Amino acid sequence: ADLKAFSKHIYNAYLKNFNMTKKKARSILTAPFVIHDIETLWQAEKGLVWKQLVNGLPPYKEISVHVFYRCQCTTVETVRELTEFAKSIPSFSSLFLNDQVTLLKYGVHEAIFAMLASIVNKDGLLVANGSGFVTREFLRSLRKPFSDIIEPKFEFAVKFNALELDDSDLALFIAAIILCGDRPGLMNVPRVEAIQDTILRALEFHLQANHPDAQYLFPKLLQKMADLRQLVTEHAQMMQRIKKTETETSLHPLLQEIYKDMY
Numbered sequence: 001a002d003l004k005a006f007s008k009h010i011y012n013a014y015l016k017n018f019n020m021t022k023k024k025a026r027s028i029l030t031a032p033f034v035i036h037d038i039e040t041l042w043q044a045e046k047g048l049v050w051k052q053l054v055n056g057l058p059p060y061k062e063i064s065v066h067v068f069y070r071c072q073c074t075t076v077e078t079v080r081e082l083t084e085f086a087k088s089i090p091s092f093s094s095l096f097l098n099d100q101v102t103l104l105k106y107g108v109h110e111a112i113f114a115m116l117a118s119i120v121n122k123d124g125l126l127v128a129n130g131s132g133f134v135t136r137e138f139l140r141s142l143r144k145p146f147s148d149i150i151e152p153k154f155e156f157a158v159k160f161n162a163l164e165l166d167d168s169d170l171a172l173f174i175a176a177i178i179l180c181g182d183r184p185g186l187m188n189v190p191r192v193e194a195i196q197d198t199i200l201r202a203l204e205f206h207l208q209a210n211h212p213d214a215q216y217l218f219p220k221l222l223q224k225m226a227d228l229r230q231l232v233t234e235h236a237q238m239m240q241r242i243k244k245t246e247t248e249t250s251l252h253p254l255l256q257e258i259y260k261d262m263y
């Protein structure tokens with residue numbers, strides 16, 4: 001059907017399902033309590049409202065692990081949102097449920113690291129629904145291997161933010177990431193490949209209207225999708241190293257299901 005109406009339905013599903021949009025994020029980043037060390041982190045854990053109460057975080061262990069647990073909490077919450085967003089797409093919900101799980105399994109991290117740029121600048125990122133701002137420099141200061149899993153996302157993010165997508169672009173781009181026919185173990189590859197093609201056509205149609213003067217932005221974005229696959233590969237490898245060497249660190253079982261059969 002019409003790609004304009006298609007794009008608009010995806011945009012609405014996005015606004016309906018993501019509490020933090022790039023619009024809101026940039027309105028904040030241009031105030032949040034700044035977290036740049038242990039003291040301000042401690043002040044934040046007492047004065048800021050977090051979706052997940054510390055309380056129920058895995059019992060405390062140390063500062064680098066505590067930050068990791070907050071990262072893991074926000075990841076799982078974003079997987080939740082991405083799942084409802086995908087289900088809010090009729091062609092996704094028409095797939096058999098096992099293919100829906102396959103697509104989410106192998107796509108959510110690519111999508112999540114794409115959306116992360118919306119809440120990032122070169123100096124840190126928003127946390128706790130925009131009420132906090134954690135400094136990139138602080139996160140660099142965590143002990144390995146926790147610092148190493150973080151900085152690569154910043155690098156991708158700052159480059160990705162140079163393309164100046166808005167939320168209406170992102171909605172289509174994230175949909176293209178999820179509805180990807182290359183994922184291992186997909187049952188109905190032709191059906192998923194055909195949905196992906198419609199989304200990609202819609203995306204190019206959208207960028208022509210929304211970004212009339214930006215040449216090469218569509219192929220640029222196709223390359224970011226390739227880049228995101230490599231970012232997630234390396235991320236999954238780092239998470240396997242943490243599972244092996246940080247045996248006291250608690251790993252959410254949903255995320256371990258995601259990494260189970262990755263290499």
Ligand SMILES: O=C(O)CCCCCOc1ccccc1CN(C(=O)c1ccc(-c2ccoc2)cc1)C1CCCC1
Binds near residue numbers: 070072075113116134
């Ligand atoms: O994938 C897993 O197994 C979970 C393991 C991810 C570990 C690496 O997480 C990050 C790496 C780079 C940038 C951002 C994140 C995490 N992150 C965050 O939103 C985030 C970052 C920091 C804090 C925080 C609070 C107090 O002090 C620090 C809270 C939340 C987003 C990445 C995408 C989905 C959420």
Ligand SMILES: CCCCCCCO[C@@H]1O[C@H](CO)[C@@H](O)[C@H](O)[C@H]1O
Binds near residue numbers: 096097098099102
């Ligand atoms: C409408 C759903 C009806 C039941 C579908 C049964 C699906 O089987 C399982 O799907 C999973 C992917 O999600 C794979 O990980 C498993 O290897 C596979 O055995």
Ligand SMILES: CCCCCCCO[C@@H]1O[C@H](CO)[C@@H](O)[C@H](O)[C@H]1O
Binds near residue numbers: 101104105257258
């Ligand atoms: C919540 C949406 C995202 C969920 C991603 C988690 C995927 O885990 C997979 O669930 C399948 C069905 O149980 C199993 O067959 C696989 O072994 C397991 O790898």
